[PDB]
């Protein structure tokens, strides 16, 4: 099991994959985002580094970055009916991770319990776990437990989003971990076995 030494090792690993902005920005909040990511099991973080994943922390909009300019004005998958486009999205995950500094908490342009953990969970799912959220086993769990964490007409509709949000509950803090264990016991056991 993880302990404070593992977390310090995780902070070192994250310092090697996180890309910070230059100039003025909320530097302490960016570092606080890293410290929340350091609670993720080190096995996942090590694998992200081995796969040369970069976690970009941004001081502006995602589409202000050169590599995401192509998404300007594009409606993200799953955002139909929001009235919004990628210009408004505070974080993305998958093959890359890009996150607006300061927008971590639920309601800051998104409804994840925590922006960076949800987005990094997607990257782990896709890059490290070969899209395990789409596996027959996780889909079976998702069908039963996917509506137990609120936002039921979004988390309960997309298995990849329920996976990422459950992962964020598991690792954000002790209260969200305990809440997940009570609300989604099969998902909790699934995530616990994954980190063995």
């Amino acid at each position: 099991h993880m302990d404070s030494t593992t977390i310090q090792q995780n902070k070192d690993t994250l310092s090697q994959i996180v890309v910070f902005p230059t100039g003025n920005y909320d530097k302490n909040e960016a570092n606080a985002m890293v410290n929340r990511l350091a609670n993720i099991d080190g096995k996942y973080l090590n694998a992200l580094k081995q796969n040369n994943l970069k976690i970009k922390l941004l001081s502006g909009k995602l589409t202000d970055e050169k590599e995401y300019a192509y998404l300007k004005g594009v409606v993200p998958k799953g955002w139909e009916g929001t009235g919004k486009t990628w210009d408004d999205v505070p974080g993305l995950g998958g093959s890359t991770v890009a996150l607006r500094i300061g927008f971590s908490n639920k309601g800051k342009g998104h409804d994840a319990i925590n922006l960076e953990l949800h987005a990094t969970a997607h990257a782990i799912d896709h890059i490290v776990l070969n899209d395990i959220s789409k596996s027959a086993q996780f889909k079976q769990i998702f069908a039963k437990e996917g509506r137990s964490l609120g936002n039921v007409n979004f988390l309960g509709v997309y298995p990849e989003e329920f996976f990422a949000e459950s992962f964020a509950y598991y690792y954000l803090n002790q209260d969200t971990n305990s809440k997940l264990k009570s609300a989604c016991p099969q998902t909790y056991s699934f995530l616990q076995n994954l980190a063995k």
Binding site: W79, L92, S95, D111, E160
Partner: peptide, 7 residues
């Protein structure tokens, strides 16, 4: 793979 945060 590209996925936005939950709306």
């Amino acid at each position: 793979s590209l996925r936005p945060a939950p709306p």
